[PDB]
Amino acid sequence: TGYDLSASTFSPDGRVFQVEYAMKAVENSSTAIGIRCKDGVVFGVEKLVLSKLYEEGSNKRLFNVDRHVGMAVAGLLADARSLADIAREEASNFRSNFGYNIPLKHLADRVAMYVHAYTLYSAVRPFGCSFMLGSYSVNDGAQLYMIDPSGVSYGYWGCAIGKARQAAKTEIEKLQMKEMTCRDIVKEVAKIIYIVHDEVKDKAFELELSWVGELTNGRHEIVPKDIREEAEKYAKESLK
Template sequence: MGGNDQQAYDRGTSLFSPDGRIYQVEYAREAVSRGAPSVGVRTADGVVFVAMSRASSTLMEAESIEKLHKLDDHLGTASAGHVADARQLIDLARRQSQGNRLRYGEAVGVETLTKFVTDHIQENTQRGGTRPYGAALLIGGIENGEPRLFAADPSGTPNEWKATVIGGGRSDIQGHLEEEWTEGLSLDAGVELGIAALAAHDDEFEPADLAVATVTEADGYRTVPVEEVAEAFAAAGLTTEDEDEDEDEDDEGADADGEAGADDDDEE
C-alpha cells in the first residue's frame, strides 16, 4: 500500500507529498540538469550569455542548435533542458515584451518580464491536466541603464544573480563562478569567465561549440562572432585540439632531434 501511495504523489502534478515535495517539479529540474549548460554573467557594462551548443552528430547543422535568443533590443535569454518547452516560454516572453511596447510605449523591465514568465511556469505546477515545463531560462538585459540577470526554474521561482548556470555540470561551473566573479568585471572579462566556467566541467570543446551573446546599453543584444569567441577562448587560457596536436608534434620533433644528436655524438 505504501508503494501505491507513493506512486499517487509521484504522478500528480499538483499534489504535495506528505514530506512537502512535488515530485513532478523535481523531475522537471532533473530534465534541466541533463541538458547542455548555459552560463549568465552580469558585468559592469552588460550581461553575458555563454552556452554549450555542440552538435550531437557531424551530420547536424550547427546553426540549427538554438540556445541563445533575443527577446527585445535590450533583452536576451539562454535556455537549458527540453528545447520545445524552452521555445514555448521564449515565445511567451517575446509576445509580452512586444505587447508592453505597444500598450505602454516603453521597453519592458527585466524583472517584470521574468516574473511574468515565472508566473506562467508556476501555474503548471498548480493545475491538473498539465505538467511542469522541463526547461529553465536565464533572462538578462538592461533596465534603467543597469544590467540585470535572472534565472527561472521549473518551479516558477525567479532569482536575481550576479553569475549563474543552468543545465548540466552545475556544481563545478557554479563553483568556478563563485570563485572568480568580481565586482566591476568588464564585458570581455565576463565572456572569458563564462567560457572558463564551462571548461571547469568539460574542457573538451572548441570555440565553434559555443554560442555567446552580450546585452549592453550601447549595442543592445549582440551575437558574438566565432572569431571573437576564439580570442576569448585563448584569453581564458584554453587551447583547441589543433593546438594540442601541434604541441605534440613539436615535442616529438624535439625528441627526434635530441636522439639524432645523441647518435651523432656516438659516431664521433
C-alpha cells in the same frame, strides 16, 4: 508511489513530485552559464555536436526576446521555444499599452506566473525548462535573472544551468564582478566552459557567446564569433 502522478495531489509529507521530477530533467542537459559585469551581461552556452548531426549554427539556445533582453535556455529544447514565444508576446503588449521598453523585473514576473500556472492542474504538466534573463538599461543598469521549473525567480550575479551546475559556479565566484569590463568577461566565460565538461562523454562541442550591455548600446546581439576569435585561444591556454 501513488502520489507522484498528478501535479495537483500532495505527498503525505507535503511536496509535489511532478515538480521534483521535472527539475532533474533540466539537470540532464548541457551547461549554460551567465555572468554580468559592471556594464553588461555576458551569456555562454555549451553546445554539443554528436558527429555531424546538423549544420554549424542550428538550434541555438541563445534566443532573443526583446531588443534589450536575452535568453540562455537549457533543458528540454522544445518547451524552451514555447517560453520564448510567450516572453516575446508579453513584451509586445507592454509596448502597446504603456509605450516604452519592458523592465526586466516585470518580464521575469510575467513569465514565472505562467510557469507557475502549469503546476496546479491535472490537465497539464510542468515545463521542463530553466533559463536566464539578461538585460541592460541606462536608467536601471544590467540585471540577470533565473527561472526554475517551479517558478521561483529572483536575481543573481552569476548562475549556471545544466549537468555542471555546482561544479562550474565554484570558480565563477573566484572572479570579480564590479572591476571587470565585459570585454574581459568574454574571455573569462570561455575558459569556464572549456575547463568543465571534459571530452569523455562528448568529444566535440561548440561555444556560443551572446552579450548585451553598454558597448552594444543596449541592443542584444551575438558576439563577433568568427571575427577576432579571442575566446577559444585564450581558453585553451589552461592546459596545465
